[PDB]
């Protein structure tokens, strides 16, 4: 009457493929060992809690977004504020850096992810295009290319935007709940999103359809990140647990959680080799997880408020973290 | 002496940007942030002066910034925390709407929905120390309706006179009773009406009282 049999048909097929868990394979893998993470550059100047931060492709420039209405691009090595962008909307919740480094996107409660062009003859950051059209707050905006940007919004829909056209090229509506985070694959052909429905769905950019759905999390998914190989991605939720999903397996392979952790997870990232899982936790701390053995190989501290955003450099040599205390610290 | 000339220029630009950011922060600090929730919201906004709408109104030399979170049908558990630190929360309800059912196969009532929202906002963890400026709008229509139809339809257990004063007082007390942390936060209630500055002055008085009480608490006196 209402597709009763279909649900279990997928369930049985997914169950049948479980032969050996990831834990068994990684028994012979040596542990990472203690990671002597220490703060090297303390980027400060934000006067309000920050929510999003994204590294540049050069691994030196990074963009920071804060509710104070100011977007600051930081020079990691010299700690210099290369640019300051006064946002018209003072409720930004997401930011992105174009791979070419020419454009910056900012979005939040306002239903717009404004595109900011850094490279101008007049030498100022002026709004290039305003991607209005969402019915709810924008949760995450990420650039596939310098002209195409994918957006996540609380209206339960993700959208592909042709920046030149200023209209949604494709709308993703399979989520039965608000979408919180968005991550792009290395090839940019496909992306994934997380939702408050405690599930993540695989989205193909050009055909505009869902390929797979994952529902391991018990609560809302807050952050997601693609594995460097591109065949898997990790997701963080309010469950206080991080989960790894393999696209070719359609099944969760391992859970990263501890008994002493009860608060939700706010950020997720991978190292260049993919062995380290940088998860930002609501308890003012970031825990480093052995992606293969699912063990706490290290921990980061020094934040006086909730950790909001973090990201590893494409060079893989340092990781920056963001917190509501308004301080950005880079660890190497 | 280990920095080149371009590095020195970059440092100068960075410190100038820092000065500009500090100046902007100082400008923003001297402002009052009020959250509007609710039902006469448009009428209250008019009398006071798809996403978040900001209204800036200055009264008695104090600048007030009111952010309207209306039209955001998305779950509020994921963006309500962005409003931490607001001096006061303006919650507006319509008295005349006790007889309305908000459609939906009459599964809810507008007064019940309003009280549920008020309880959720007041008992929210982020607002454990935020005063609420409760507004009861549409008093004239409330009186006109209670003249014919008693409010007991919305309140099965209220056995009392149907006069305007008693019914309004009972509704106000019912809204007040939702406070589970009455000691920490004050709930200002006003029968707003829709004429003159009777709302702007009440908001100003509530803000002044909240500020004074917070200052006294800081010293430990109050």
């Amino acid at each position: 009457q209402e597709a009763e049999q279909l649900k279990n048909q997928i369930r049985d097929a997914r169950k049948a493929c479980a032969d050996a868990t990831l834990s068994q394979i990684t028994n012979n893998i040596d542990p990472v060992g203690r990671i002597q993470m220490r703060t090297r550059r303390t980027l400060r100047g934000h006067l309000a809690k920050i929510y999003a931060m994204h590294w540049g492709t050069d691994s030196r420039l990074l963009v920071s977004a804060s509710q104070d209405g100011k977007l600051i691009i930081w020079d990691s090595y010299t700690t210099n504020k290369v640019h300051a962008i006064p946002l018209r909307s003072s409720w930004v919740m997401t930011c992105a850096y174009a791979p070419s480094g020419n454009y910056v996107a900012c979005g939040g409660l306002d239903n717009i992810c404004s595109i900011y062009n850094l490279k101008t003859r007049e030498g100022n950051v002026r709004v290039s295009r305003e991607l209005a059209g969402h019915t709810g707050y924008l949760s995450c905006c990420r650039f596939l290319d310098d002209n195409q940007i994918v957006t996540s919004s609380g209206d339960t829909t993700c959208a592909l935007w042709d920046i030149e056209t200023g209209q949604q090229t494709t709308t993703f509506t399979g989520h039965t709940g608000d979408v919180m985070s968005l991550s792009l694959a290395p090839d940019t052909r496909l992306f994934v999103s997380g939702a408050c429905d405690a599930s993540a769905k695989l989205w193909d950019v050009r055909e505009g359809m869902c390929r797979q759905t994952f529902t391991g999390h018990e609560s809302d998914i807050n952050a997601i990140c693609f594995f460097p190989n591109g065949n898997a991605f990790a997701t963080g939720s309010d469950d206080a647990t991080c989960r790894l999903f393999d696209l070719r397996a359609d099944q969760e392979l391992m859970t990263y959680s501890h008994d002493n952790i009860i608060c939700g997870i706010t950020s997720v990232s991978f190292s260049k080799s993919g062995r380290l899982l940088l998860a930002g936790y609501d308890d003012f701390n970031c825990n480093v997880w052995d992606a293969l053995k699912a063990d706490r190989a290290g921990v980061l501290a020094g934040h006086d408020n909730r950790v909001s955003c973090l990201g590893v450099t494409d060079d893989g040599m340092a990781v920056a973290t963001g917190s509501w205390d308004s301080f950005l610290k880079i660890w190497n | 002496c280990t920095l080149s000339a371009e590095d020195k220029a970059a440092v100068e630009r960075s410190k100038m940007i820092d000065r500009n950011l500090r100046e902007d922060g100082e400008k923003a600090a001297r402002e009052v942030k009020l959250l509007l929730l609710g039902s006469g919201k448009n009428t209250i906004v008019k009398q006071m002066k798809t996403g978040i709408v900001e209204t800036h109104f200055t009264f008695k030399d104090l600048h007030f910034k009111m952010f309207d979170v209306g039209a955001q049908r998305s779950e509020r558990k994921k963006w309500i925390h962005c409003f931490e630190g607001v001096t006061a929360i303006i919650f507006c309800v319509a008295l005349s709407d006790y007889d309305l059912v908000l459609a939906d196969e009459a599964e809810m009532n507008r007064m019940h929905a309003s009280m549920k929202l008020f309880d959720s906002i007041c008992n929210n963890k982020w607002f454990t120390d935020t005063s609420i400026i409760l507004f009861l709008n549409k008093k004239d229509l409330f009186e006109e309706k209670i003249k014919k139809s008693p409010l007991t339809i919305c309140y099965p257990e209220y056995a009392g006179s149907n006069t305007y004063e008693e019914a309004a007082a009972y509704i106000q007390c019912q809204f007040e009773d939702l406070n589970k942390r009455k000691d920490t936060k004050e709930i200002y209630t006003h029968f707003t009406c829709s004429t003159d500055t009777k709302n702007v002055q009440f908001v100003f008085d509530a803000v002044t009282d909240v500020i004074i009480k917070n200052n006294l608490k800081d010293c430990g006196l109050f």
Partner: single-chain antibody, 232 residues
């Protein structure tokens, strides 16, 4: 973007004249300003510098004291006071704008300048050839040398290549010895060692004819080479 200079004219020795530049099309406050002179039938020479906010002000040895610079951010105009003009001061001053941050392009725009007709550890930049006869469609290479290593420990080679076509202001081609300036053909390319630098034109065109100049920015006493004059 446009920069227009004013105040040029004939001044007798010992007089004082102020040269003013008007900005239009960009944020004058954000950009820094420079003054580069060019004596008739001669090369370039940096004159003075002022940074955004007037915090940093520098002058060349030959003009320090006599010449002072100031900025007026509200009006978007630059001023360069000149006192006790000497016969050596007879040159056409060009106003330049630079912005200093990672990935920036200092000296990315040059004005038409204002003509003025009057009457030590410095890194000297020397160019091998003053002029080189060339023909269109043939690769052309220009080499310059520096007395001191311009490659700082940060890893950036502070070499700037400027092209000044006949009857036109200088144009920036390469600003850090490896990066092409905005609005320039990809034909131009830059390469060199810590002390030797070379500018290669992949295929010479008609517009390429002009005088090529080099500059060092590691130390603020900027020095310009004699220049390479390509002719068809």
């Amino acid at each position: 973007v446009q920069l227009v200079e004013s105040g040029g004219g004939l001044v007798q020795p010992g007089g004082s004249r102020k040269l003013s530049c008007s900005a239009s099309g960009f944020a004058f406050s954000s950009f820094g300003m420079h003054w580069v002179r060019q004596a008739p039938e001669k090369g370039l020479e940096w004159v003075a510098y002022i940074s955004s906010g007037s915090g940093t002000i520098y002058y060349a040895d030959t003009v320090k004291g006599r010449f002072t610079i100031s900025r007026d951010d509200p009006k978007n105009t630059l001023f360069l006071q000149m006192t006790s003009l000497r016969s050596e001061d007879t040159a056409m001053y060009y106003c330049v704008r630079s912005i200093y941050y990672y990935g920036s392009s200092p000296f990315d725009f040059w004005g038409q300048g204002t003509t003025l007709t009057v009457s030590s550890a410095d890194i000297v930049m020397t160019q091998a050839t003053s002029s080189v006869p060339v023909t269109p469609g043939e690769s052309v290479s220009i080499s310059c040398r520096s007395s001191k290593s311009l490659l700082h420990s940060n890893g950036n080679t502070y070499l700037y290549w400027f092209l000044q076509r006949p009857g036109q202001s200088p144009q920036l081609l390469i600003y850090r010895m490896s990066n092409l300036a905005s609005g320039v053909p990809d034909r131009f390319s830059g390469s060199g060692s810590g002390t030797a630098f070379t500018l290669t034109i992949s295929r010479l065109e008609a517009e390429d004819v002009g005088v090529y100049y080099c500059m060092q920015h590691l130390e603020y006493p900027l020095t310009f080479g004699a220049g390479t004059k390509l002719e068809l």
